[PDB]
Each structure stands twice: as structure tokens, then as C-alpha cells.
Symmetry: C2
Subunit: 240 residues, 2 copies
């Protein structure tokens, strides 16, 4: 149990709610933000629609939207994990670890699960890699202010495929959900992280929730839903 909502504009913390803002958790599918940067920077990923890769082993697909061909745009939209894993297999562990350290991403632990030698494709899936809400903000701001050693194309294409919608006031919303499992019934924890931008202003945010009990719905969706209310409220205060 415990939540966090952080919102930060440049060096200014505008909102800090909840008790968990310095607790590290697995990033789950929010790690696709970092994978996008690696994919476009390495040249494995080309643009919003290329490359398109086909699905394999459909019997292990728990969401029907994953059973179609995927490209970087659909990858983020559908949160398609198998596309992430095909990408890291192409990158290889050396380059994968190189990017994780260059991004100073959370605890930077890509060793994976014990007895599995599966860090390359599982480090971010309720496993070794762990990041706090404060550390999500730190990473996202390095994207926003282009402080990372990656190409201009990596920044632009990552931004393009993270776009979600326009919020009141014209604040454009970019971000990513992710659900992980706390380590019997499944105890979820959920993220929604990203930023909103209007004119020359960018506000980075991170929302996390940790369930104490099994739940009817994906924790990421509840985190996103709560976060959007908190962002609506913040925008109203900002526009006074």
C-alpha cells in the first residue's frame, strides 16, 4: 500500500502527494520509454511506422491486440511486450547495459531473475530493475531537456510515439502506463509517467500506486485515471 504523485516543472516541484515518492518499484511497461530511445538511437527502430515485425507464439499472448503485426507506434499504444523483447534481443546485453548506465536509469540492475539468465528480456518485468517516482522524473527530464547521449531522431520519434491526447488549456499529454507485480494472489502495482507541454512549458509527472489486495482492474489504468484528475486540477491552478 502507498501512492505517489509528483509533478515538476524544470527545477520546481509543483506537487508531491503520497508516501512512496522515494520507493523504488519495477518500471514494468514504463520501461518502453527507455527502450524507445535505445531503439531509435541504435538504428534498430526507424520511424513511427517502421520496422513492422510479425507476432510469433500467439498461444502465450494474453491480450488480443498483441496478436497483430507491430511497429513503434502500435508498440507503445498496445504496450506490446513481445516487441520490446524482440528489440532487446537485437540490441544485445552489452549495448542494453550501456544504455541503461548512460541513462542512469533507477538502480541500473539488468541482471534479471535468479536462475534464469533472462536480464536482456525480463529485467524490467517485476525483476531486478527498479526505479522510484523521483527517479522517473529525473529520467524523463533528461529526455525533455535532451541531456542524454542519443540522436535527435531518438528524441523526436520517442516523443512522437508517446503522444496521447490534448488536455484542457492545450496541454499536450505524453506518457506511458505500466503494471508490475509485488513479490497466493497477484498484488499489482501501477505506473503512469510522462509530461504535459504547452508553448514553452513542460511539466514532468509520475504517478504510482501499490495495491494491498487483489484488484478487479489493471493497476496502471487506475494510476493513469487518478493521475489525469490530478493533472486536470494542477492545470486549473496553473492557469489562474
Amino acid at each position: 500500500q502507498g501512492t505517489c504523485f509528483l509533478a515538476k516543472e524544470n527545477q520546481t516541484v509543483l506537487k508531491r502527494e503520497g508516501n512512496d515518492c522515494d520507493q523504488r518499484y519495477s518500471p514494468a511497461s514504463t520501461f518502453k520509454i527507455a527502450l524507445s530511445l535505445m531503439g531509435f538511437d541504435s538504428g534498430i527502430l526507424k520511424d513511427e511506422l517502421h520496422p513492422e515485425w510479425p507476432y510469433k507464439k500467439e498461444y502465450e499472448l494474453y491480450l488480443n491486440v498483441w496478436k497483430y503485426p507491430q511497429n513503434p507506434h502500435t508498440w507503445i499504444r498496445d504496450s506490446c511486450v513481445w516487441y520490446s523483447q524482440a528489440l532487446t534481443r537485437q540490441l544485445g546485453m552489452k549495448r542494453f547495459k550501456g544504455y541503461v548506465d548512460a541513462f542512469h536509469y533507477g538502480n541500473q540492475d539488468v541482471s534479471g531473475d535468479r536462475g534464469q539468465n533472462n536480464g536482456l528480456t525480463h529485467a524490467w518485468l517485476s525483476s531486478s530493475l527498479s526505479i522510484s517516482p523521483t527517479e522517473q522524473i529525473q529520467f524523463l527530464q533528461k529526455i525533455i531537456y535532451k541531456k542524454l547521449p542519443v540522436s535527435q531522431k531518438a528524441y523526436i520519434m520517442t516523443k512522437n510515439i508517446m503522444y496521447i491526447q490534448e488536455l484542457p488549456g492545450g496541454w499536450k499529454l505524453y506518457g506511458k502506463t505500466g503494471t508490475g507485480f509485488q513479490l497466493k494472489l497477484p498484488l499489482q502495482h501501477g505506473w503512469f509517467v510522462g509530461w504535459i507541454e504547452k508553448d514553452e512549458r513542460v511539466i514532468t509527472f509520475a504517478k504510482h500506486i501499490a495495491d494491498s489486495k487483489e484488484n478487479n482492474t489493471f493497476a496502471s489504468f487506475r494510476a493513469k485515471n487518478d493521475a489525469l484528475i490530478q493533472l486536470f486540477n494542477l492545470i486549473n491552478e496553473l492557469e489562474k
Copy 2:
């Protein structure tokens, strides 16, 4: 009580809850109907025109309403004063004509009891009421072009109601709205919210209209519009998973 309806062409894919035939004020979901009237009448020109300025006589329930508004921002910001500036320009003869021709709910634009304000208040916790089932009926008339409006009215309304792309490539169009449940003769508002999220999702040639409504039995710590949309988005995701089998 709640309702969730989803309909693809003539197929009712989902009908959940017990409140699907009870009429409620449309609140800001009525902006969908106003959009069609605005573009058909020519008062609204395109997604960015006309731009109208805020005036201090308008009430600022949201600070984003203090900036100039056009059809795009009107929907995005749910700007009530822009709606009222539009209906004042339309006038009652045109307004009533569209409401009746659209067969919109109870078609009652008489306004607040005793106030002669139907033109600017009928849809705001007031005389006009529509059920979730009737919202689907109205939305289907937009999708299949059964309304007496121009081709441009349909296209521009769709353009400004766009929200986002959902998993599977389903594009989401829609609008929230919150009102206050009324006493028996509508002489007073009660502190009981009710909230809507209605619209449609579209992929290739498929369109599924939907309507979500929630009626509170007691005061609530969260704005009803947000709860209705948040619940509806989860239910649409689950529906999309079925559709994509």
C-alpha cells in the same frame, strides 16, 4: 444506478446496469448536439473559427475558460460560456427546431422553472433530459447520417470530438458531462451528482457507439464526469479485447 451501452451498427454488444432507460440532464454531453447545430447553421465555421473572447460577465468555473475559445477548445475545455454564446446567436426558433428534429430526449427546452432561460440553460441540470438508450439513438444518427444537417456539420463535429487512439487502433470520440439530480418538479437541485461519458470508437469501417452514466445516491469526493469516463475507458478496453479476437 449506472448504465453502460455499446452498439455496433444494429448490434447491442453491451448493456450493463439498471439505469439505461432513465432520463437525466445531458449536461455537457449536449455540446455534441450544439456542435451539429453550430456548423449546420454556419455560426461555427471550422475547428478554429470563430474565436470568441472571454468576458468577465461569464462565470469562470475553470480557469482555462478565461482564454479565447474556438470550436476546438470549446470541446477540449468543455467551455460552457461558448455554448451559451452559440445558442444566443442561434436563437430559440433555430434551437427548438434542431432539438425537435434531432428527437433529443424529452425535447424540453423550457429551461429552469420560472426563469425564461431555456435558450442558455435547458441542458444544464434543467428541463432537458435524455436516457442512455436515447443517447445511443442520437449518436447512431450522427454515425449513419440520419440527421437534417450538412455534410460539413458531420465532419467538423467529428473533428472536434476526437480524443485519442486506443489499443488496437480504435479512435475515440466523445464528451463527458456532469449535472445535479433535481427535486421532483425540478424546482431545486440536490447535492447528488450524475455523470456521463458518451461517444464512439472507430476502426476502419467499424463504429461502436457507447454511453456510460452514473447516478450517485450520496455526495461524492470525485467529479462524476471523471468517474464515468474512467470506468468507461476500462470497459471499452475490455470490449476492444473481445472485438480483436
